[PDB]
Amino acid sequence: AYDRAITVFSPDGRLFQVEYAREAVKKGSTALGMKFANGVLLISDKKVRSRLIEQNSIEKIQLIDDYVAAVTSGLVADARVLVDFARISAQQEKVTYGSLVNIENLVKRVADQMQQYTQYGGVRPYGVSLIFAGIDQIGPRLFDCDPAGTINEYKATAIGSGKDAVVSFLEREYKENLPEKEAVTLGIKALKSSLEEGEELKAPEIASITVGNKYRIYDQEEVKKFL
Amino acid sequence: AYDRAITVFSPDGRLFQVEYAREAVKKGSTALGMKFANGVLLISDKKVRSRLIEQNSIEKIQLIDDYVAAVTSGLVADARVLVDFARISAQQEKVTYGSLVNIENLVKRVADQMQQYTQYGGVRPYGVSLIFAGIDQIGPRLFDCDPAGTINEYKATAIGSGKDAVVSFLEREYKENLPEKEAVTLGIKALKSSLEEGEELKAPEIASITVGNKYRIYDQEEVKKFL
Amino acid sequence: AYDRAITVFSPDGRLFQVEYAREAVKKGSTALGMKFANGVLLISDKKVRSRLIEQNSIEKIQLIDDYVAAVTSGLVADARVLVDFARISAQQEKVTYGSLVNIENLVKRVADQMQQYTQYGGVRPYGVSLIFAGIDQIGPRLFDCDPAGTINEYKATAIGSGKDAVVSFLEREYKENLPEKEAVTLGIKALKSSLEEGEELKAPEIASITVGNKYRIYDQEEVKKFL
Amino acid sequence: AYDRAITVFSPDGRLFQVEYAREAVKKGSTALGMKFANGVLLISDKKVRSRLIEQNSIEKIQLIDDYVAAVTSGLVADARVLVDFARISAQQEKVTYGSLVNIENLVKRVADQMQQYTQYGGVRPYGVSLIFAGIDQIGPRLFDCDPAGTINEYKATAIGSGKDAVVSFLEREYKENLPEKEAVTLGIKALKSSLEEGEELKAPEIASITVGNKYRIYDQEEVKKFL
Amino acid sequence: AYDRAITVFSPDGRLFQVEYAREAVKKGSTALGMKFANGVLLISDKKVRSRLIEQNSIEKIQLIDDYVAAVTSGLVADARVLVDFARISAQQEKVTYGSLVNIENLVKRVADQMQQYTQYGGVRPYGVSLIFAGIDQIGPRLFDCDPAGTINEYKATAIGSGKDAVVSFLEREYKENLPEKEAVTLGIKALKSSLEEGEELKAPEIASITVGNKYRIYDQEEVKKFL
Amino acid sequence: KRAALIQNLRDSYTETSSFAVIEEWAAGTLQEIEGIAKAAAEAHGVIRNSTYGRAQAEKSPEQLLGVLQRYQDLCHNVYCQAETIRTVIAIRIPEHKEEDNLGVAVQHAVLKIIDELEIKTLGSGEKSGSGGAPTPIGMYALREYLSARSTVEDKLLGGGSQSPSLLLELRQIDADFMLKVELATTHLSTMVRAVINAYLLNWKKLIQPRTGTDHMFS
Amino acid sequence: KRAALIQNLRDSYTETSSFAVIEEWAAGTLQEIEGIAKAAAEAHGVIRNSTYGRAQAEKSPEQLLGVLQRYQDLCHNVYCQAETIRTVIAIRIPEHKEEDNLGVAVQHAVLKIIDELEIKTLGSGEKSGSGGAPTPIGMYALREYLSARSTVEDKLLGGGSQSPSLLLELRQIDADFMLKVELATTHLSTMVRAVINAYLLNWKKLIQPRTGTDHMFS
Amino acid sequence: KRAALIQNLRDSYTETSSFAVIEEWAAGTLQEIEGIAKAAAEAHGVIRNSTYGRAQAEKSPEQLLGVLQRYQDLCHNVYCQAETIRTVIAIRIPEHKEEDNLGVAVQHAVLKIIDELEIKTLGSGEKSGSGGAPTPIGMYALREYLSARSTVEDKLLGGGSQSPSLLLELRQIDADFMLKVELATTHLSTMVRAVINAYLLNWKKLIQPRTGTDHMFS
Amino acid sequence: KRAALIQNLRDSYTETSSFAVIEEWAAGTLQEIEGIAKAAAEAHGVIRNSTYGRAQAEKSPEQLLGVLQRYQDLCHNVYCQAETIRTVIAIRIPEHKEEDNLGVAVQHAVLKIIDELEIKTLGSGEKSGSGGAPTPIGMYALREYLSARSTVEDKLLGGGSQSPSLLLELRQIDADFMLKVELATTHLSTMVRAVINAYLLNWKKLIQPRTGTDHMFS
């Protein structure tokens, strides 16, 4: 009915095509991000499809530069095209202005690219949500972006399948300005609260930055110390 | 029938696709604007989705420049694309003419951008209404703009879900040339008259401008003094 | 329903058109690739349609240069257009940068070409999967790419009809850093484990490279020594 | 269903539109080609629609230059457009490189032209198969090309209605490196094995080349000597 | 079904839209052309719709230059656009090469124009067949061209409604190298053999050329001498 | 051999058989229907001016038996000749394809109204359908007459019944079945002329449903 | 093993069984139908020139019993051979897909008219459908004859009834069921020739509904 | 726990139960149907060469009772095993979505012809539908035999009736219900082979109607 | 207040009532159906090896009355619990819109097969539809037994009738209604397992047919 084209509003004024692209997000792995004292971190679960897969390869935390990073959920091909568009857009802003002063406009350029395909006929939306995390001259920023293009800046969030559960746990347990170790411990407990018990958390990815430093990926052993 | 394309009139000559885009406006938060003695103000409710949201972030009152401001309702991604188009258009008029003499043509350029997509196939309309408020060389101006592109200049209005109620209370209570404190008090009472009682008004956004001055966002405490 | 256009998401956020293009891959011949000690190899079955066919002609292992090679499965016309696009893209990177330092972006350019046609209306996807194998300045790389555009780097894989068998046998039997003769013997045993017994393996193609060397196609007798 | 557009895969990953264009090939006259000792030949049946038709006119063997030739089957208007595109492409390669060193890329350019219309919406495929035969610097080449764009190089083949029969007889009777008279005798016997007996073979066209020579059409009497 | 778009093959690989355009040809007036000794002629019937029509006006034989002429059948508006395209194409070949050496490529340019519209979506075919007749440096040429774009060179033919009858009589009665008077007498008898008796042949148009001469329209009295 | 079998079928019932049937329908059959209608009108005029007693339940009127038997023989000839046309059409339904169904749709459109002539008009079945019997009387008019007459004659003869409306129902059964012959002959004339028109307009596609040269294929 | 079971089914009823059935229908069956029609016409000519009394309700005419029993055996043979063709087609309906249904549509189109031959023409069911019985008489003609005859014979014999229209209804039942044999043999000839035509045109897709090489897949 | 309940259902009736039913149908059931058909043919040959008097209305032939009871037990076994296949399919109809309905359409297509085997062929209902009963005889053949026989035996015994066509209708009821057993066994063979074919071609989608990895989702 | 009324309805029949019904069906009801089937099989084995005279028309067998009354109580419990599930679903059909009808289509798809369980399987209506009664026996099996038995007992007792096929029809009515209990319990098992499967797969959309945040609207 009002259903099979991106350019058709419903009689209540909804785009069901966009919300179906939002339903595409819920099939991905759970990732979270949170602000802490002078910094911000990202944590991400992974589907380990088999034992023949490379571990040290396609990773759910992706760097956008040395001062913006991002995680994705949804269609992985769309998500990779998005992360590469974000990298090219960040480098264009660096050529134009010498530096990236606000992460928010990098998020805005990615989100306007996503909004542009919820409007013109002959394209489909992007079935991906993203979380951006980094340091800019305002401070630590943390965003999400969705198939509609809606931008939200948070203290903490998740995306993916277990998103609600993780959000609910943070809806009881998150405090500002934690030290980095306590913040990661809270994040790992949050990610465990989204699993269905019996099923146990294999080694996730964690990235973090503090103000005045560069990027920092936890290797697997440092992650094992919190499991 | 006459129903699923933007380029098709009804037998009564209606565009149901446009009015369906107008139904998207009614699911947004209520905002209002009103003129007072040498000035104009905007007040806006907010959905506070959770306690994990940032307060000091994406805000329903957006500045278009140091002499034009705007509130939106409807599809939030479309609304952000619209506010950014309005900002770029205002800065283009400032390049061309050195100043913004009439807010009305900024509103007209935004509304022609909105009207252009109620006509051409393969695009959908913008499911957003906007209220513009500011000072120009004519005086205090106050507008709304809708998914059809229709422009209206008012003394006072609302947009959003409680719009009718907020209009009807102003249809009993609005007077010209109030002092600013009385005008904001009338606006807060108007916004309270749209709620369903039991439900209480959490801290809303209020902006205001007077002739010869720039903008002035109330911080939260100055808002608390009127609740 | 949600079914006959590339630009339409399902209510679960799936593109059935893309997964139908993925069903085209399963009708092709089985090919595999695996990393070994300082090197990487490709093995491929062939349909021998008749005895009137040329043997020494259109071959399932194709060179992309002297330092990237590839196998395909699916629609053979699309696959040949893809291998030629990969060759032109490799030569463009060699003009721009003097050398190919990472195979991954050659794979990324091919995969972005494949992703671009899962999005725009009026085109169909490419019903082909590819495996890329080679040496770059990081080491031996081994990839697959699919009609969606999804890139994965592996130790070992298959594509084609017997893929699920050949993966599963490798899911029991693959070890890192084998000598080359043992790795090819493991691959031939893997390819035999996908046949339906009674049916026997005629002469397959095998290519391989070690670090610091160029390309090396086995002729048919050197293949016969392992059958 | 999955049936009336070129840009729609089936749930098994098939393009029925392309295979219907392949069904268009089977309504044409049978033609064959085969390699022999230092050379290659083409033989083609003809529908003689009436006695008022010109014999010495539109012919099923067409020259692409003095060192590539071709036969077609299918829609005759598409086939003429294809042979003219092949001639223009051959002359472009001769301008660029001074000579045609491999026939295979002339076939590849024609086949990429044919593949391009199995993909973009708003065009139909070409309902023609072609056989190319000639001498290049590799040796005698012999190809076929089909509505999908699939290229195959052969010792011997047919296209057209009796194709299967002409293949099967060659699947019993073809030998490499025959002298030219024996190769043509085998071809005429192959073409007779596709007729339905009672019906007799009127005068067919035969072309051939040996290495180091140019092109050579049999006139009708030299053909009569083999009937 | 496979029926209402030019870009859709049938399951048997037919374009019904093209053959439907070929059915438009059968509603036109019968015209014929034939070669004779050192020359070629055209004869054409006409619908005389009323007595108020101008005789000496829009005529079924049209000159393409002083050394190519043509008759049409089918949709008359399409036919006039075709004859004007043929005239412009002949004059372009005369600008480029100084003369028209082969009529066949003028016919090929017209037929490629007609074939181009049996392929791209959003256009219909040309519902017209044409016969070209003239002298070039090869000799007397005589062609027909159809909505598919198929070109045939003949000794003699018809187009139009009575085409089959006029072919069948020529299938009994045509001989090469007749003198011009006998050839026109045979043509008039052929055109009379397509009428349904009782209905009688009013004054038709006849054009003719011999080698080394220019064009020659029979006036009406010289035509009356053969009725 | 298969083409030999198809050729034996199509040489058995050519187009000339069906066209001879159409010549018989245009010339003699409509005059026969009009004559049966006039005999029915005369018999109904005889019945209308009559007053019945017990003695009319003691014998069956042979005039009405002659009219009904004549109409029965008419409907038999019409059904057999309509089946001849139906067979001539039906043995030329070509290879079933999902295309090229202009002439096939012509053949089904003619077979549908020949079915309407046989089923809905002649009433030549065991039971009528859920649409009913829109014909006023069927193929087996005379058995309906004798059955519905025999029930009332059994009620009148038996001491016999004393209801006068039963005696008037006797006269009314006689008049009503002649009236049914009138209405059924009129509707049968309409259906026969419709079938003649459809055949004489569509026989070129009825015989050759799929023509067409592969001009484009060589 | 599953393919062994499918192979045993398809080797049980090959194409040659159905084509032998088509050879039997083209050669002998239509001549048998015409002979039954001529016997029915001769019996109806005997009945038409007869006047019945009480004594014709005392015995059943064995000529009509022979005609009806002959037609019953005919319809039995036709139904069993039609079921043979139906089984040959039905054991080759391929894997159910939402595509590639040209030959599957051919198979359903042939099975639909074989269903029309069995159900609507032979009348081989317990009860007729809501569309009715468009055949004039069914598979069980002779039981209908004996039942509808026995009711009238019970009414005539009993003191017997005095209605003369009952006595004429006796003659009319005899004539009408011979008439039903005539009409049913004509319609059965039409249906049999239609089935022969459809099989001999469509058997290539009836046996192989899905062919086609994966030329493009390697 | 809900998944425990679904697992108990699907472990109750696995695929091996239905495939064992298909093995029983391919091996023994068709031979049993052919044996019942031969017994019916022999009994009908006994009835065809017989002339009945009053004494045949005094006893019921136990041969026909044995044939009908054997066919009744056959149809009971076929209906119960068809319901076993129907349950094996029906407890795997997945979550109802407006997409991904290839295997769901396969399951409904197989359940439709199993419904045709049960309803239209075995006649296992109280009343037949508006399409009628296209089976020649139903699940309850022997009750139909005894009822339609007992009415005629009551009319013959009573002074008994003097209609000879009633006495011939006795013989005709006997012959016709053996004929119904012949026709019904033939059509049941056709339906059983059709169900065996459809199951052995489609069981992979009957058991797993929705497969498919979220390759693209991570 | 309107939302108070809707809340009172939805708090009356929560999801736990229907899921308790599903627990009762998976655990006890199927075992009860199997027990009724075994009692029917034992009673049918008793009837099969018996020869009846006049004395069996003088008393009604209380074993068959017990089996039929047990099956009647079973069908009553199944119908009431199916109506409980139907009410739990039907009081959550949301506001009727021309959109967002995924869960609404799930609810109608589950209510359709609960209607099939009630109507087509339990036979709980006054009259069966035009599709017939595809159940072998209905809700009111025991009244059908007593009526069809009482007609034959009236014909046998009366001087009683002398038809032996009437006496065998007595035995056949007894055996056939036990056979109907067997077939109806089998089909009821199939329908109950289908309903259990559909509920346990679709209950999340049955309870909440329309979810979804206005994320985009603020």
Question: What would the DSSP string read from start to end of chain B?
Answer: ---S-TT---TTS--HHHHHHHHHHTTSPPEEEEEETTEEEEEE------SSB-SSSS-SEEEEETTEEEEEEEBHHHHHHHHHHHHHHHHHHHHHHSS---HHHHHHHHHHHHHGGGTSTTB----EEEEEEEE-SS-EEEEEE-TT--EEE-SEEEESTTHHHHHHHHHHH--TT--HHHHHHHHHHHHHTTSPTTS-----EEEEEETT---EE--HHHHHTT-
Burial of E80 (0-12, 13-18, 19+ CB in 10 A): middle
Query: Is the Cβ–Cβ distance between I170 and H143 less than 8 Å?
Result: no
Distances in Å between the alpha carbon of B131 and those of B42, B63, B145?
Answer: 9, 12, 6
Q: Does residue F218 lie in a domain region?
A: no
Q: Does residue G215 lie in a domain region?
A: no
CA–CA separation, A56 and I28 (whole Å): 54
D and F make contact (3+ CB pairs below 8 Å): yes
Q: Does F214 touch chain D (CB under 8 A)?
A: yes
Distances in Å between the alpha carbon of C217 and those of C42, F36, H50?
Answer: 10, 96, 87
Query: In residues, how long is chain G?
Result: 218
A149: left (phi over 0), alpha (psi -120 to 50) or beta: left
Query: In residues, how long is chain A?
Result: 227
Task: Answer yes or no: do F96 and G131 touch at CB < 8 A.
Answer: no
Sheet holding C61-63, edge to edge: C61-63, C68-74, C128-135, C140-145, C151-153
- By C-alpha distance, the chain D residue nearest C81 is D112
Query: Is the Cβ–Cβ distance between D104 and D145 less than 8 Å?
Result: no
- Show Cβ contacts of residue C43 under 8 Å, excluding neighbours closer than 6 positions: C31, C32, C33, C184, C187, C188, C191, C204, C205, C206
Q: Which of I31, I195, I8 is nearest to I117 (CA)?
A: I195
Distances in Å between the alpha carbon of I82 and those of F2, I85, I91, I94, I124?
Answer: 59, 5, 14, 21, 12
Give chain F positions within 8 Å (CB) of G123: 126
CA–CA separation, H134 and G139 (whole Å): 12
Q: Residue A159: helix, strand or coil by DSSP? A: strand
Q: From the CA of G206, how many Å to the nearest CA of chain C?
A: 26
Pair of tokens at residue C193: 């484990």
Task: Answer yes or no: do H150 and I163 touch at CB < 8 A.
Answer: yes
Give chain G positions within 8 Å (CB) of F80: 182-183, 186
Pair of tokens at residue E48: 């005389």
**Neighbouring chains of G at 3+ CB pairs within 8 Å?**
C, D, F, H
Query: Is the Cβ–Cβ distance between E10 and D20 less than 8 Å?
Result: yes
CA–CA separation, D172 and D167 (whole Å): 9
Q: What angle do CA A78, A114, I213 make, to 5 degrees?
A: 100
Q: Which residues of E touch F (CB under 8 A)?
A: 1-3, 10-12, 14-16, 18-19, 22, 146, 148, 150
- By C-alpha distance, the chain H residue nearest G12 is H193
Q: What angle do CA H51, H55, H59 make, to 5 degrees?
A: 110
List the resolution, Å: 3.4
- By C-alpha distance, the chain E residue nearest D126 is E119
Provide the residue range defining the domain that includes I150: 1-208
Q: From the CA of C11, how many Å to the nearest CA of chain G?
A: 21
Q: Does G33 touch chain F (CB under 8 A)?
A: no
Distances in Å between the alpha carbon of G147 and those of A204, F150, G44, G66, G74?
Answer: 87, 18, 20, 16, 21
Q: Does residue H214 lie in a domain region?
A: no
Query: Is the Cβ–Cβ distance between F185 and F31 less than 8 Å?
Result: no
Cβ neighbour number for residue B122 with a 10 Å cutoff: 17
Give chain G positions within 8 Å (CB) of D145: none
Distances in Å between the alpha carbon of I79 and those of A57, C28, I117, I125, I188?
Answer: 58, 54, 8, 11, 11
Broken C–N links (> 2.5 Å) in chain E, after residues: none
**Helix, strand and coil percent figures for chain D, each rounded to 5:** 35, 25, 40
Q: Residue A157: helix, strand or coil by DSSP? A: strand
Q: Does residue G213 lie in a domain region?
A: no
Cβ neighbour number for residue D188 with a 10 Å cutoff: 18
Tell how many helices (H) and how many strands (E) occur in chain E. 6, 9
CA–CA separation, C75 and D149 (whole Å): 10
- DSSP track, chain I: -HHHHHHHHHHHS-HHHHHHHHHHIIIIIHHHHHHHHHHHHHHHHHHHT----SGGGSS--HHHHHHHHHHHHHHHHHHHHHHHHHHHHHTT-----SS--HHHHHHHHHHHHHHIIIIIIT--SSS-BTTB--SSS-TTHHHHHHHHHHHHHHHHH------HHHHHHHHHHHHHHHHHHHHHHHHHHHHHHHHHHHHHHHHHHHH-S-----SSB-
Query: Is the Cβ–Cβ distance between A157 and A142 less than 8 Å?
Result: yes
H or E element: which one contains A88?
A: helix A76-97
Q: Which residue of G97, G98, G212 is in closest CB contact with D19?
A: G212
H or E element: which one contains E61?
A: strand E61-63
Query: Is the Cβ–Cβ distance between E146 and E118 less than 8 Å?
Result: no
Q: Does residue F214 lie in a domain region?
A: no
- List the alpha helices (DSSP H) in chain C: 16-25, 76-97, 103-115, 163-173, 180-192, 220-224
Give, as one character, the DSSP assignment of residue F119. Answer: I
Cβ neighbour number for residue E47 with a 10 Å cutoff: 10
Q: Does F144 touch chain G (CB under 8 A)?
A: no
Sheet holding E205-210, edge to edge: E156-159, E31-36, E39-44, E205-210
Q: Which amino acid is at F69?
A: Q
Q: Which residues of D touch C (CB under 8 A)?
A: 1-2, 5-15, 108, 111-112, 115, 118-122, 148-157, 167, 170-171, 174
Query: Is the Cβ–Cβ distance between G174 and G60 less than 8 Å?
Result: no
Query: Is the Cβ–Cβ distance between G135 and G123 less than 8 Å?
Result: yes
CA–CA separation, A55 and A203 (whole Å): 10
Pair of tokens at residue G119: 């159900």
- DSSP track, C56-108: SSS-SEEESSSSEEEEEEEBHHHHHHHHHHHHHHHHHHHHHHSS---HHHHHH
Give chain A positions within 8 Å (CB) of H216: 75-77
Burial of G111 (0-12, 13-18, 19+ CB in 10 A): middle
The dihedrals phi and psi of F168, each to the nearest 5 degrees, come to -70, -25
Q: What angle do CA F71, F75, F76 make, to 5 degrees?
A: 115
CA–CA separation, C158 and C31 (whole Å): 5
Dihedral sign, Cα of residue I148, residue I149, residue I155, residue I161: positive
Q: Does G146 touch chain H (CB under 8 A)?
A: yes
SS3 per-residue string spanning D107-130: HHHHHHHHHHCCCECCECCCCEEE
Q: Does H161 touch chain G (CB under 8 A)?
A: yes
Query: Is the Cβ–Cβ distance between C166 and C29 less than 8 Å?
Result: no
Which residue is it, tokens 């609960």? I114
CA–CA separation, C145 and C70 (whole Å): 11
CA–CA separation, H121 and H188 (whole Å): 7
CA–CA separation, D210 and D39 (whole Å): 4
Q: Which amino acid is at G72?
A: Q
Query: In residues, how long is chain E?
Result: 227
Dihedral sign, Cα of residue I96, residue I101, residue I107, residue I110: positive
- By C-alpha distance, the chain A residue nearest C14 is A24
Pair of tokens at residue I148: 């069809």
- Show Cβ contacts of residue G184 under 8 Å, excluding neighbours closer than 6 positions: G71, G135, G136, G137, G141
Query: Is the Cβ–Cβ distance between G196 and F5 less than 8 Å?
Result: yes
Give chain A positions within 8 Å (CB) of B5: 8
Tell me the Cα Rg of chain B: 18
Pair of tokens at residue G182: 């005539």
Give chain D positions within 8 Å (CB) of C51: 171
- By C-alpha distance, the chain A residue nearest I217 is A14
Cβ neighbour number for residue D147 with a 10 Å cutoff: 31
Q: From the CA of D158, how many Å to the nearest CA of chain E?
A: 19
Q: Residue H200: helix, strand or coil by DSSP? A: helix
Distances in Å between the alpha carbon of E67 and those of E97, E159, F81?
Answer: 15, 21, 63
Pairing of strands D216-217, D128-135: unpaired
Dihedral sign, Cα of residue G162, residue G163, residue G165, residue G170: negative
CA–CA separation, G76 and E155 (whole Å): 64
Give chain A positions within 8 Å (CB) of H214: 27
Q: Which of residues 55-84 of H touch G (CB under 8 A)?
A: none
Task: Answer yes or no: do D47 and F216 touch at CB < 8 A.
Answer: no
Which residue is it, tokens 């568009």? A85
Pair of tokens at residue B67: 């002499």
Count: domains in chain H: 1
Q: Which of B117, B4, B119, B141 is nearest to B64 (CA)?
A: B141
CA–CA separation, B81 and B89 (whole Å): 12
CA–CA separation, D173 and D155 (whole Å): 12
Cβ neighbour number for residue B210 with a 10 Å cutoff: 17
Give chain C positions within 8 Å (CB) of D10: 20
Q: Residue D44: helix, strand or coil by DSSP? A: strand
Q: From the CA of H186, how many Å to the nearest CA of chain I?
A: 22
CA–CA separation, A76 and A71 (whole Å): 11
Q: From the CA of F218, how many Å to the nearest CA of chain D?
A: 4
D and I make contact (3+ CB pairs below 8 Å): no
Q: Which amino acid is at I214?
A: D
Give chain C positions within 8 Å (CB) of H212: 19
Pair of tokens at residue E173: 């009665």
Q: Does I99 touch chain A (CB under 8 A)?
A: yes
Q: What angle do CA B35, B41, B47 make, to 5 degrees?
A: 130
Burial of G39 (0-12, 13-18, 19+ CB in 10 A): buried
Domain boundaries, chain A: 1-227
Cross-strand bridge partners of residue C74: C128
Distances in Å between the alpha carbon of D12 and those of C12, G42, G98, G202?
Answer: 21, 63, 10, 27
Query: Is the Cβ–Cβ distance between D71 and D61 less than 8 Å?
Result: yes
Q: Which residue of I131, I172, I197 is in closest CB contact with H91?
A: I197
Give, as one character, the DSSP assignment of residue F57. Answer: G
Query: Is the Cβ–Cβ distance between C135 and C209 less than 8 Å?
Result: yes
Task: Answer yes or no: do D148 and C74 touch at CB < 8 A.
Answer: no
Half-sphere exposure of G122 (CA within 13 A, CB side): 27
Q: Does H215 touch chain I (CB under 8 A)?
A: no
Pair of tokens at residue H188: 């049941």
Interface test with C, best of D9, D118, D164 (most C CBs within 10 A): D9
Query: Is the Cβ–Cβ distance between C73 and D104 less than 8 Å?
Result: no
Query: Is the Cβ–Cβ distance between A68 and A99 less than 8 Å?
Result: no
Tell me the Cα Rg of chain I: 23
Task: Answer yes or no: do I215 and A18 touch at CB < 8 A.
Answer: no
Q: Does residue G79 lie in a domain region?
A: yes
**Neighbouring chains of H at 3+ CB pairs within 8 Å?**
A, C, G, I
Sheet holding B151-153, edge to edge: B61-65, B68-74, B128-135, B140-145, B151-153
Query: Is the Cβ–Cβ distance between G117 and G197 less than 8 Å?
Result: no
Q: Does residue I193 lie in a domain region?
A: yes
Cross-strand bridge partners of residue C71: C61, C131
Q: From the CA of H3, how many Å to the nearest CA of chain A?
A: 14
Interface test with G, best of C48, C49, C124 (most G CBs within 10 A): C49
Broken C–N links (> 2.5 Å) in chain H, after residues: 158
- Show Cβ contacts of residue B109 under 8 Å, excluding neighbours closer than 6 positions: B86, B89
Which residue is it, tokens 């696709």? B17
Query: Is the Cβ–Cβ distance between G136 and G187 less than 8 Å?
Result: yes
Q: Which amino acid is at E24?
A: A
Q: Which amino acid is at I5?
A: L
Q: Which of I191, I76, I90, I51 is nearest to I140 (CA)?
A: I76
Experimentally, the structure was elucidated by: cryo-EM
Query: Is the Cβ–Cβ distance between E188 and E170 less than 8 Å?
Result: no
Tell me the Cα Rg of chain D: 18
Pairing of strands C216-217, A68-74: unpaired
CA–CA separation, H138 and G20 (whole Å): 31
CA–CA separation, B69 and B124 (whole Å): 26
Q: From the CA of I214, how many Å to the nearest CA of chain B?
A: 8
Q: Does residue F216 lie in a domain region?
A: no
Half-sphere exposure of B36 (CA within 13 A, CB side): 18
Q: Residue C135: helix, strand or coil by DSSP? A: strand
Q: Which residue of D115, D122, D153 is in closest CB contact with C122?
A: D122
Q: Which residue of I132, I166, I169 is in closest CB contact with H125?
A: I132
- Show Cβ contacts of residue C211 under 8 Å, excluding neighbours closer than 6 positions: C38, C39, C135, C139, C140
Interface test with G, best of D20, D22, D23 (most G CBs within 10 A): D22
Cβ neighbour number for residue G160 with a 10 Å cutoff: 15
Distances in Å between the alpha carbon of C222 and those of C29, C182, C226, D58, G43?
Answer: 21, 14, 7, 50, 89
Distances in Å between the alpha carbon of E197 and those of C61, E170, E186, E189, E194?
Answer: 72, 19, 18, 13, 9
Give chain C positions within 8 Å (CB) of A127: 9, 13
